Write a protein that binds this ligand. Structure first.
Ligand SMILES: Nc1ncnc2c1ncn2[C@@H]1O[C@H](COP(=O)(O)OP(=O)(O)O)[C@@H](O)[C@H]1O
Ligand SMILES: [Mg+2]
Lengths: 57, 375, 63
């Protein structure tokens, strides 16, 4: 029925909307692991700098 | 008529005319743009004997009338035809007088400026509308979607337009019109049905076959593989019950008809499929926002009631464009009324009456004033 | 700002869905009751026409 058409439409579209908010969140999560990766890289380089510091000292 | 002097909202879409009052959710008088004329001369008396037949009257009297199109792909044949159909819409269908209500109209994208000047002049002289505004249907569909970013695919009955708009800004440099539309669909289906044994030329069968397109047609996921499996396809083959009662069976044609827009080489167009036209449109503009265009594409038109455009659209664009970002199409149900809804939206706010095209401005500067008053 | 207004009107239509159901349901119930009374109307009409054909037969042999 036309009502059935609309029903499936709002339900399926809200389903895709929820999935899509899931994946946009997942994109933010990916950029978060990215930020964590650069921060850990900087931390490791800083540790190397500190050890070289003590050796030079 | 409402006690208030609210404006008229009329979408003269290329294929359908939808008219009503401002503040309403849906247009009240909606009719196809076909116009019927007496196929023969007058000798009888007592009834009928009327020249112009419009709306459902002509739909019922399709067989007796030569069915003609006052507009095709934007081109205007006879302004008298628009005069009569607007008279019918305003008085016999809307039961409204245009004297006391300004009119907001929507026009096909990239319509002739000379066409606008002549239509506005004949309008103002013939009618007594207090004020005027005309807008492109692209921004109207945008308003219906309510998102300032996206590329609008307007699939009318005469032209298909691709128009990119970023953050509520038109991009005419990346706007294109393609001469494929409902007319082509009916034509191609006509020749295929001719190869199926049924050969008709008249417009009644044109409406029958467009109804068939509305009901049964597919958009093939894979084309040649689906005809290969549609060789026999007893289950996949689908039938229709024509009003005369004969059962007409169609198989692969269901998804071989809309495919022509995607594959224009079937009947000889240099331009590739409409997905290529959206692709080129996207790259013409700066690289960076292109991803947003990919993710914000909108489709509008009566044809959109068919299935299969969304899946085909996304898959082919992902094939053409890198598949990092996710592409998703948005299309609200019953979007062929959406343009008219946007017209109501225009009349909703109180700034809209700052730029009504009043009678005295046209009387001062002629039609030429619109060249400075709309754009 | 305009978009939220659309989100709202669709919602209006959405609930209106049930209101569209009501007229169809009353029309269905009207068809219901009309068919149900047509039952006994048909039965009584059959009995009446049987009586009429009986009168036809008696007038047939009477002539
Ligand atoms: N309910 C429907 N289902 C499927 N197709 C439809 C329906 N109503 C109209 N159409 C198709 O839409 C076409 C008209 O397009 P239209 O909506 O007038 O374009 P525009 O949006 O430019 O006004 C017709 O040729 C018809 O085939
Ligand atoms: Mg359209």
């Amino acid at each position: 029925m036309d009502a059935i058409k609309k029903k499936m439409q709002m339900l399926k579209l809200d389903k895709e909307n929820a999935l899509d908010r899931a994946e946009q969140a997942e994109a933010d999560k990916k950029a978060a692991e990215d930020r964590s990766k650069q921060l850990e890289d900087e931390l490791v380089s800083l540790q190397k700098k500190l050890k070289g510091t003590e050796d030079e000292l | 008529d409402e006690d208030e002097t609210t404006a008229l909202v009329c979408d003269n879409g290329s294929g359908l005319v939808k008219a009503g009052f401002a503040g309403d959710d849906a247009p009240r008088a909606v009719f196809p743009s076909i116009v019927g004329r007496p196929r023969h001369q007058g000798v009888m008396v007592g009834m009928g004997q009327k020249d112009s037949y419009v709306g459902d009257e002509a739909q019922s009297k399709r067989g007796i009338l030569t069915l003609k199109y006052p507009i095709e792909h934007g081109i205007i044949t006879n302004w008298d035809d628009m005069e009569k159909i607007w008279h019918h819409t305003f008085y016999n269908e809307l039961r409204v007088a245009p004297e006391e209500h300004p009119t907001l109209l929507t026009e096909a994208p990239l319509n002739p400026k000379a066409n606008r000047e002549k239509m506005t002049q004949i309008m103002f002289e013939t009618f007594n509308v207090p004020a005027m505004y005309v807008a492109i249907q692209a921004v109207l569909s945008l308003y219906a979607s309510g998102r300032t970013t996206g590329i609008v695919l307007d699939s009318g009955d005469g032209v298909t337009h691709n128009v990119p708009i970023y953050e509520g800004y038109a991009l005419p440099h990346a706007i294109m019109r393609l001469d494929l539309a409902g007319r082509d669909l009916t034509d191609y289906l006509m020749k295929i049905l001719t190869e199926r044994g049924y050969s008709f030329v008249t417009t009644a069968e044109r409406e029958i076959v467009r109804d068939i397109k509305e009901k049964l047609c597919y958009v093939a996921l894979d084309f040649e593989n689906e005809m290969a499996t549609a060789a026999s396809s007893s289950s996949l083959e689908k039938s229709y019950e024509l009003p005369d009662g004969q059962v007409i069976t169609i198989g692969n044609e269901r998804f071989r008809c809309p495919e022509t827009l995607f594959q224009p080489s079937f009947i000889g167009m240099e331009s590739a499929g409409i997905h290529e036209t959206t692709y080129n449109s996207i790259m013409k503009c700066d690289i960076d926002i292109r991803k947003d265009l990919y993710a914000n594409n909108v489709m509008s038109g009566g044809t959109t009631m068919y299935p299969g455009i969304a899946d085909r659209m996304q898959k082919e664009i992902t094939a053409l464009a890198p598949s990092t970002m996710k592409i998703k199409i948005i299309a609200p149900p019953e979007r062929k009324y959406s343009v008219w809804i946007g017209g109501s939206i225009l009349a909703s706010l109180s700034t809209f009456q700052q730029m009504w095209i009043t009678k005295q401005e046209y009387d001062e500067a002629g039609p030429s004033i619109v060249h400075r008053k709309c754009f | 700002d305009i978009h939220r207004k659309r989100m709202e009107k669709d919602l209006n239509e959405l609930q209106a869905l049930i209101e569209a159901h009501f007229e169809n349901r009353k029309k269905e119930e009207e068809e219901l009751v009309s068919l149900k009374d047509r039952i006994e109307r048909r039965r009584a009409e059959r009995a009446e026409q049987q009586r009429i054909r009986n009168e036809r037969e008696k007038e047939r042999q009477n002539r």
